[PDB]
Design a protein around this nucleic acid. Structure first.
Ligand SMILES: [Mg+2]
Ligand SMILES: [Mg+2]
Ligand SMILES: [Mg+2]
Ligand SMILES: [Mg+2]
Ligand SMILES: [Mg+2]
Ligand SMILES: [Mg+2]
Ligand SMILES: [Mg+2]
Ligand SMILES: [Mg+2]
Ligand SMILES: [Mg+2]
Ligand SMILES: [Mg+2]
Ligand SMILES: [Mg+2]
Ligand SMILES: [Mg+2]
Ligand SMILES: [Mg+2]
Ligand SMILES: [Mg+2]
Ligand SMILES: [Zn+2]
Lengths: 53, 216, 120, 114, 122
RNA sequence: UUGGCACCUCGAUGUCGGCUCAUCGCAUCCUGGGGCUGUAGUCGGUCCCAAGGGUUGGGCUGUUCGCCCAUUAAAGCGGUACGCGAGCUGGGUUCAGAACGUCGUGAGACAGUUCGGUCCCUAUCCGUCGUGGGCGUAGGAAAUUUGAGAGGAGCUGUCCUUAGUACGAGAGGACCGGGAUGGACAUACCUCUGGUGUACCAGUUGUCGUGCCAACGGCAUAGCUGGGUAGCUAUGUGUGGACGGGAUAAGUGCUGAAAGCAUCUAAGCAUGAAGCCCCCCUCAAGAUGAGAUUUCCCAACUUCGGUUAUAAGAUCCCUCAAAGAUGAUGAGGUUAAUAGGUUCGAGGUGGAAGCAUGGUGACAUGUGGAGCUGACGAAUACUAAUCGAUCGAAGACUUAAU
């Protein structure tokens, strides 16, 4: 129910090994050359699959 | 002893000679080939490696298992066979009889043969102790705050621990299961189908390994 | 099918509203899960439209909401009329794939995947 | 259709001799019965309350009142046990399953002929 | 499916009209019985002047069940009611008349006298 | 067990019974193997070996017990904080109310009774059950594997035959052996029988809408009612504990001396249990002792130390389900049937709308097994799986052999 002992800084940091965010899945856009999320419309130019959206 | 690999098409029924209803599972055992033969001299045990179901040949930018990779294609090519989706060994079968690149046919099995069928059971996902271990529910009334819980997990100060193999909630299904002493009702050479009396483990489209019964 | 985090009645209503909205505007922005459920609903309405029979129009009337679309000519057309009129004519030669979805990326508020679904 | 392989294997089992009957039709069913060594045909006459399934797995249920007690017999449609089926009467019903008939008795259970 | 506390109508002229199942015979932990199974029962309701009396612990064989029985051919038989016959130790019926249809499964059980006395066997 | 003692705990170690879940001992309740018998046979009594598995439902009582009913092969006895209340209950007991008997002058009291009476807690650590990532396993990979270990399973009735034979005055009635079929339990699966089936079909009430009729929509538990596909399921359908082998216990011997005899033991040699080790089933090389087999990839630079991106390969991301909390796993990603749509079916529902006809009308009939249809089978690039990106070898030393 309650923690019997305090968590050391070491123990806490070990648990936070996997607590991280991944780099966004991004590719350079063909039309403009700005990075865009893959399988998503490019916000800068508004083009997907070489067609304006 | 004989072994063939197939997919579970589904279940049906067939009427026997006496008019008895026989529940059966339809298995398709097309495209079985002896990819490799293992011997005590080389591998330390005698078995035949059999590949079932052809897959597409290697392509440069294959992104799926539909197309064979270079390593698999080489192993199949050594047998002079097309790349196979599923490959399994049969130790029961005698090595001498079979030859590498030889097709294994449904006709090997005959009607009335007693067989043992192996397959991976259907997955149920995360399951509680009642479903998973056939445990009893607690009272559903009379002040009960115990319904589908696992019960006591141990004693008290003696042991002061949960023993290993305590039945608890966890993932259920996906286990390899062998049903023994099933029978072949019929073999269809034309459709490449074997009818097996009863039900076999796993989902439809699941690989089934049919072998001669070890117990005789 | 997807429950869409709503009760059965609320889901049905939302899908009817979404379908009607797509018919009126011919493009809408929504969450991915909602769009994937809508594509089936709208396309089945287009199928009824292309048939064009009274039974089809009465069956289509069930799903479609009672809305008025104002034309540039200032003529007033109901959504049901538009589906059985212009939209049916457009996709006469096409078998399926009346709608398409384009992913727009996450929105600020809830980080939900914003997508555009559009007829054609 | 159903799976093509399943249909092919069970196709032989299917019988074409059987007559076409709907639920609510009185049928006379001649069933081959074995009593000891002796084999004889015993006839069960009852309204068809239900028809379900398809292929070799298709079945029908016939309901009779025997000695003041209702009896229902479910037969596999393609069972070789049934010598023949005879449609004595064609009845008017508004549903596929006539489970309501189980509760009803006497005049209430009567079904109007087509 | 007959379990303890199940009440069955008695299809005979023994003098018992209704019985409650004290026990299902067949082994330890045996819970349910179907047609052709002997049960230990008490006479909850009895017709006057019968050989069997109310409050009598007696043995009976089940002749009809709502659950019914599945035959090997894949055919089924079901009844509208659950019924039993009060039987002697020899399996001979205590009563001299059996009422209503009885399953053929009784013949297998060697309850031949009940089968003969029965009006119809289905 | 009832006690003795007062050694831990009074800045709290929850107390009876039941439920859930067990686990262990064996002084064995059943089943297995034996010795003796006042062991004819069938049955028994007693003792020895044996813990593999099994060892029921009810009535009364808070009960534990016990008695009773009906079973069963049998209804074993104990330990585990009289196992188990951060798993459950709260009937008893052990607060405040009230009452009876009783005791007390009284306030009150009673291992006397009676009626009523608040059971908190979001798991930090170990432990346990599942499920991933990192690194290692002297190149990098894709598969197929061996099994050091480990877990699971392990139960029994009845009937027939042998045989009315052995045995017995008769009554009764074997072993050994060979079959058949159940009970309980375990597991797999949905063909069948059923259950469910809130995006399936139909009937129907009230009310409010779509201008009205007709036809529909909303709300009323899914409004209610009758059915029901897939999936998930038991009460449903299959299968299992088979047949054996090795070593043994209590036993039973063979040969045999010490001890001219005798002696199962001392040397030696057999036989002998549901038990042990196997056989059967599942997991398993982090088995750091990291195993094996098959196949794939194999170059340039360079300070000569080594580096490099790339290869084989695998991912990101995307369409998904047979998989799934999420990871993971599997099916696919245009050189494409992965999903949606479309087209055609299966199964389900049970006769759409419209129109016609008959009827005063409610309705009926025809068109027409009609119309509709989530998950199921097939087909079809119409839509979406775009374009891309990232990771990922070049193989240490020593010795022996060649
Ligand atoms: Mg319970
Ligand atoms: Mg509750
Ligand atoms: Mg505790
Ligand atoms: Mg002292
Ligand atoms: Mg303290
Ligand atoms: Mg002992
Ligand atoms: Mg205790
Ligand atoms: Mg209390
Ligand atoms: Mg008081
Ligand atoms: Mg006291
Ligand atoms: Mg089905
Ligand atoms: Mg209304
Ligand atoms: Mg109206
Ligand atoms: Mg309101
Ligand atoms: Zn761009």
């Amino acid at each position: 129910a309650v923690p019997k002992r305090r968590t050391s800084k070491t123990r806490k940091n070990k648990r936070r090994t996997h607590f991280k965010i991944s780099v966004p899945g991004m590719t350079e856009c063909p039309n403009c050359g700005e990075y865009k999320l893959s399988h998503r419309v490019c916000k800068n130019c508004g083009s997907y699959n070489g067609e304006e959206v | 002893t004989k072994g063939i690999l197939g997919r579970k098409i589904g279940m049906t029924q067939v009427f026997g000679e006496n008019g008895e209803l026989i529940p059966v599972t339809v298995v398709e055992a097309k495209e079985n080939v002896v990819l490799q033969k293992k011997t005590v001299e080389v591998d330390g045990y005698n078995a035949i490696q059999v590949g079932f179901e052809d897959k597409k040949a290697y392509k440069k930018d294959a992104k799926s298992n539909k197309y064979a990779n270079k390593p698999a294609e080489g192993h199949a090519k050594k047998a002079d066979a097309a790349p196979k989706r599923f490959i399994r060994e049969f130790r029961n079968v005698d090595v001498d009889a079979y030859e590498v690149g030889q097709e294994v046919s449904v006709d090997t099995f005959v009607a009335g043969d007693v067989i043992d069928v192996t397959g991976v059971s259907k997955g149920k996902g995360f399951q509680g102790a009642i479903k998973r271990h056939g445990q009893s529910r607690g009272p559903m009334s009379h002040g009960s705050h115990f319904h589908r819980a696992p019960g006591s997990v141990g004693m008290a100060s003696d042991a002061s621990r949960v023993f290993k193999g305590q039945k608890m909630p966890g993932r259920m299904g996906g286990n390899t299961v062998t049903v023994q002493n099933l029978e072949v009702v019929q073999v269809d050479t034309e459709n490449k189908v074997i009818l097996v009396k009863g039900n076999v483990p796993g989902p439809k489209k699941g690989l089934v390994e049919i072998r001669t019964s070890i117990k005789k | 099918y997807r429950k869409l985090g709503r009760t059965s009645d609320q889901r049905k209503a939302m899908l009817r509203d979404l379908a009607t909205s797509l018919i009126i505007s011919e493009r809408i922005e929504t969450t991915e899960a909602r769009a994937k459920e809508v594509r089936s609903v709208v396309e089945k309405l287009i199928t009824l439209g292309k048939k064009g029979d009274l039974a089809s129009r009465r069956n289509a009337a069930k799903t479609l909401r009672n809305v008025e679309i104002l034309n540039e000519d200032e003529t007033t057309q109901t959504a049901l009329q538009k589906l059985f009129g212009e939209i049916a004519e457009r996709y006469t030669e096409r078998q399926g794939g009346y709608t398409r979805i384009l992913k727009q990326g996450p929105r600020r508020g809830d980080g939900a995947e914003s997508v555009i679904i559009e007829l054609v | 259709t159903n799976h093509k392989l399943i249909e092919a294997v069970t196709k032989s089992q299917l019988r074409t001799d059987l007559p076409s009957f709907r639920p609510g039709d009185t049928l006379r069913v001649h069933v081959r019965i074995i009593e000891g060594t002796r084999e004889r045909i015993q006839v069960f006459e009852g309204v068809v309350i239900k028809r379900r399934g398809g292929g070799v797995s298709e079945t029908f249920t016939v309901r009779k009142i025997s000695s003041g007690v209702g009896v229902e017999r479910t037969f596999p449609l393609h069972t070789p046990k049934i010598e023949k089926i005879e449609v004595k009467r064609r009845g008017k019903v508004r549903r596929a399953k006539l489970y309501y008939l189980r509760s009803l008795r006497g005049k209430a259970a009567r079904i109007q002929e087509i | 499916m007959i379990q303890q506390e199940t009440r069955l109508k008695v299809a005979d002229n023994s003098g018992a009209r209704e019985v409650l199942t004290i026990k299902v015979l067949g082994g330890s932990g045996r819970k349910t019985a179907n047609i052709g199974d002997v049960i230990v029962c008490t006479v909850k309701n009895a017709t006057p002047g019968g050989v069997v009396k109310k409050g009598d612990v007696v043995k009976a064989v089940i002749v009809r069940t709502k659950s019914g029985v599945r035959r090997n051919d894949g055919s089924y038989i079901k009844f509208d009611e659950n019924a039993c016959v009060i039987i002697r130790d020899d399996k001979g019926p205590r009563g001299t008349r059996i009422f209503g249809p009885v399953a053929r499964e009784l013949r297998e059980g060697n309850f031949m006298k009940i089968v003969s006395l029965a009006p119809e066997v289905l």
